[PDB]
Amino acid sequence: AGSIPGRRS
Amino acid sequence: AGSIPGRRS
Amino acid sequence: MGSMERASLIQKAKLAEQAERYEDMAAFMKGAVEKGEELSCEERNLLSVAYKNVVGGQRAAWRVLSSIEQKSNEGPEVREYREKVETELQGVCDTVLGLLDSHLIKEAGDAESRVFYLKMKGDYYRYLAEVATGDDKKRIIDSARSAYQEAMDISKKEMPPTNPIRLGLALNFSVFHYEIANSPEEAISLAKTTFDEAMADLHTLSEDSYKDSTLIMQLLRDNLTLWT
Amino acid sequence: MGSMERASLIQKAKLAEQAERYEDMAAFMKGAVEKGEELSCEERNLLSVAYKNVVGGQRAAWRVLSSIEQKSNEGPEVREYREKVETELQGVCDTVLGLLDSHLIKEAGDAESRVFYLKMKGDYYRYLAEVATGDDKKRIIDSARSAYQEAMDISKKEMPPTNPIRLGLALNFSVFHYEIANSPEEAISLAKTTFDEAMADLHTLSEDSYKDSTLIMQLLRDNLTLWT
Ligand SMILES: *Cc1ccc(S(=O)(=O)N2CCCCC2)cc1
Ligand SMILES: *Cc1ccc(S(=O)(=O)N2CCCCC2)cc1
Ligand SMILES: [Cl-]
Numbered sequence: 447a448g449s450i451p452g453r454r455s
Numbered sequence: 456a457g458s459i460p461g462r463r464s
Numbered sequence: 465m466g467s468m469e470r471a472s473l474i475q476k477a478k479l480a481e482q483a484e485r486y487e488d489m490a491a492f493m494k495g496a497v498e499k500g501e502e503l504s505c506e507e508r509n510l511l512s513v514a515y516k517n518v519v520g521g522q523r524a525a526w527r528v529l530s531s532i533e534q535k536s537n538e539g540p541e542v543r544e545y546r547e548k549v550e551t552e553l554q555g556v557c558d559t560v561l562g563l564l565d566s567h568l569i570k571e572a573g574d575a576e577s578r579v580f581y582l583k584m585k586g587d588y589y590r591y592l593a594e595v596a597t598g599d600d601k602k603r604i605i606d607s608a609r610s611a612y613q614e615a616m617d618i619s620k621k622e623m624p625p626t627n628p629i630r631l632g633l634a635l636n637f638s639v640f641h642y643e644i645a646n647s648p649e650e651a652i653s654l655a656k657t658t659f660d661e662a663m664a665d666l667h668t669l670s671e672d673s674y675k676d677s678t679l680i681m682q683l684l685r686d687n688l689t690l691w692t
Numbered sequence: 693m694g695s696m697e698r699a700s701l702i703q704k705a706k707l708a709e710q711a712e713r714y715e716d717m718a719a720f721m722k723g724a725v726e727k728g729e730e731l732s733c734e735e736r737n738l739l740s741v742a743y744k745n746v747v748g749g750q751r752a753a754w755r756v757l758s759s760i761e762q763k764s765n766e767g768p769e770v771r772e773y774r775e776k777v778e779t780e781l782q783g784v785c786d787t788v789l790g791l792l793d794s795h796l797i798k799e800a801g802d803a804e805s806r807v808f809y810l811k812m813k814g815d816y817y818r819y820l821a822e823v824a825t826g827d828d829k830k831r832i833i834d835s836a837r838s839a840y841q842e843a844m845d846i847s848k849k850e851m852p853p854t855n856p857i858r859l860g861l862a863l864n865f866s867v868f869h870y871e872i873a874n875s876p877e878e879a880i881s882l883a884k885t886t887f888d889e890a891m892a893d894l895h896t897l898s899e900d901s902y903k904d905s906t907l908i909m910q911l912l913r914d915n916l917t918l919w920t
């Protein structure tokens with residue numbers, strides 16, 4: 447299950 | 456130009 | 465970072481992102497928050513990206529070590545080192561939670577900022593819950609749930625169903641239900657309803673907003689495919 | 693790490709590698725070196741892997757920042773932050789060089805250990821040279837050259853031409869010639885001679901040694917293809 451990657455602005 | 460990667464034992 | 469100008473901290477956080485120096489990026493953005501002014505949309509994203517990358521690497525390492533430790537229970541070094549990584553992860557989550565509590569949330573009045581920060585609060589309690597064991601796990605889980613629920617309530621009143629923050633909040637709250645709260649049916653229902661209500665609002669969007677919203681919709685669909 | 697057992701530091705360095713926690717891995721291996729005993733072959737590799745990963749991330753970040761800084765010269769923040777990363781990189785190189793000087797090299801009597809450590813000494817002076825500017829660049833370059841040359845002299849007397857340490861030394865010394873010493877013809881001649889002399893010795897090797905040696909030969913060939 448994936449959450450928001452949110453690793454790149 | 457590549458040196459030894461040497462990043463994994 | 466008290467002696468560095470706010471604008472210089474923000475500039476350096478952007479440089480640190482380009483250099484993939486996420487620990488530095490998080491420290492610059494912590495310094496920027498501690499200047500005491502509210503954050504713009506782009507600054508909120510820099511704060512979130514920085515800490516998500518830092519804690520994401522800690523979580524990945526904790527999962528590797530926890531897996532080795534579980535196999536070994538089927539000397540003290542594996543447990544000691546898993547505990548060290550766990551304590552470091554908890555410290556980063558506590559730092560982010562402390563920024564949100566002092567004083568980002570209380571000063572956030574617009575829906576976009578308040579939802580963003582409450583989603584972050586849910587996320588960092590969720591990361592604490594992933595490593596928590598026992599009754600304190602219960603209170604940590606409830607803190608995540610409460611933050612996500614307040615963010616959901618605001619987002620449903622104040623944002624359209626395609627808003628990317630609203631969508632990412634629903635995605636992460638669905639992951640909370642599936643992975644933390646042992647509520648897979650709630651996870652599936654939230655992801656489905658969120659996807660369907662966004663689909664029905666896509667007609668209102670520009671090409672660029674459409675691209676932003678459909679990207680997160682695909683993540684919801686990816687989870688539904690894994691869960692059903 | 694003075695209070696942790698040597699064997700526990702080595703065990704934790706292996707766990708840190710699996711967890712991709714290379715800063716921790718380097719700190720565990722520094723603690724192990726500081727116990728004062730010589731390192732086995734596998735322990736030397738753990739030390740080298742740990743620091744190569746740490747300094748490799750610093751070098752990649754320094755190159756990103758140096759490129760941004762050069763474009764901006766075609767406020768002080770880019771230079772300040774490049775300088776911060778540069779100082780951190782130099783500190784890691786100085787730490788590794790200090791381990792080699794106190795006292796890994798002087799206690800290394802077998803060719804395999806002495807060549808390994810002298811190659812590391814050349815590598816970490818080479819990384820210092822990459823960021824050095826001016827006349828101190830000259831002395832740093834000569835320190836790299838001297839370490840690589842002593843390692844080469846021992847390796848040619850004491851190891852077969854397919855030995856992987858001998859091959860990796862020649863590879864990295866050829867990169868030194870091409871990238872640092874402004875001697876591309878020396879780089880090309882060393883890579884060619886090293887490749888050809890290894891080719892002629894492959895017949896002596898087992899299947900597993902053949903695989904180890906040909907892997908590094910392909911790296912020499914990859915550089916020759918880029919340089920010619
Ligand atoms: C919680 C959340 C963070 C970011 C976004 S986004 O800005 O729309 N974006 C960033 C990560 C890559 C995909 C989407 C949405 C929700
Ligand atoms: C300098 C050097 C280090 C390691 C090796 S190796 O053990 O043969 N190996 C490790 C990196 C991946 C490819 C080869 C050789 C030289
Ligand atoms: Cl406000």
Ligand SMILES: [Cl-]
Pocket residue numbers: 730799800801802
């Ligand atoms: Cl010895």
